[PDB]
Amino acid sequence: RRNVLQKRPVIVKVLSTTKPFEYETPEMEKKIMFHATVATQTQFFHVKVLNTSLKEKFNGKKIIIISDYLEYDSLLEVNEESTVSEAGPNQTFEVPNKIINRAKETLKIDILHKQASGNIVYGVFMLHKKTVNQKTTIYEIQDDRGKMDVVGTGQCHNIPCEEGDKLQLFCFRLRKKNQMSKLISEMHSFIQIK
């Protein structure tokens, strides 16, 4: 149910948030969002927060209840139609450290080269080389097992960084270049220099 608001509340610890950033809609309009990573006692979720008025609810000082969110791309979208509120005195919990650690893992690039087209990728990767073009930036990212291209457009075009900088990627689309994988920026994608 791609476009159906999920009523089933999800009750989560906020593990991390990004700064707010500007993103370009398909029609080239500018909107504001931030990314979040949240966890239950048994799983973690990446969360697109398109309603930046919620930033303080995601400050990670409190367990929160999210309802009327969208579910797709294995992630949660919290938008202007969503509700977020602090969990009650009886609804609080701690997240097992195994989940917190799993949430922050990055796949090796040889694994990404064998991954199916259409998957979503979040991860921290070292920059080998950057080429800025008219509307695209090719960020060549590398680990000890491989190298792959990151195609940045819109808010992901022409981000300042140097060889050896760690790029934190949010919500990239894996696509195939003749059996090699590439990571393609989409409307809600983000690059943070780490």
Positions touching K ion (CB under 5 A) are: 16, 19, 21-22, 35, 37, 93-94, 97-98, 186-187
> C-beta of 110: minimal distance to K ion in Å?
25
> C-beta of 58: minimal distance to Br ion in Å?
11
Give the Cα separation of 163 and 156 in Å (integer): 17
Token output for 98:
């195994």
> C-beta of 123: minimal distance to Br ion in Å?
31
Phi, psi of 179 (to 5 degrees): 80, -20
Report what 113 binds from K ion, Br ion, none; CB cut-off 5-8 Å by kind: none
Strands annotated E in 19-81: 21-24, 30-39, 44-49, 64-67, 70-72, 75-78
Report what 85 binds from Br ion, K ion, none; CB cut-off 5-8 Å by kind: Br ion
User: Would you give the DSSP letter of residue 52?
Assistant: G
- Return the bridge partners of 71, or none: 76
Report what 86 binds from Br ion, K ion, none; CB cut-off 5-8 Å by kind: Br ion
Report what 8 binds from Br ion, K ion, none; CB cut-off 5-8 Å by kind: none
Q: Is 131 in the site for Br ion (CB under 5 A)?
A: no
Q: Using CB under 5 A, which of 20, 30, 72, 86 touches Br ion?
A: 86
Q: Single out the residue of 125, 118, 128, 173 nearest to residue 151, CA to CA.
A: 173
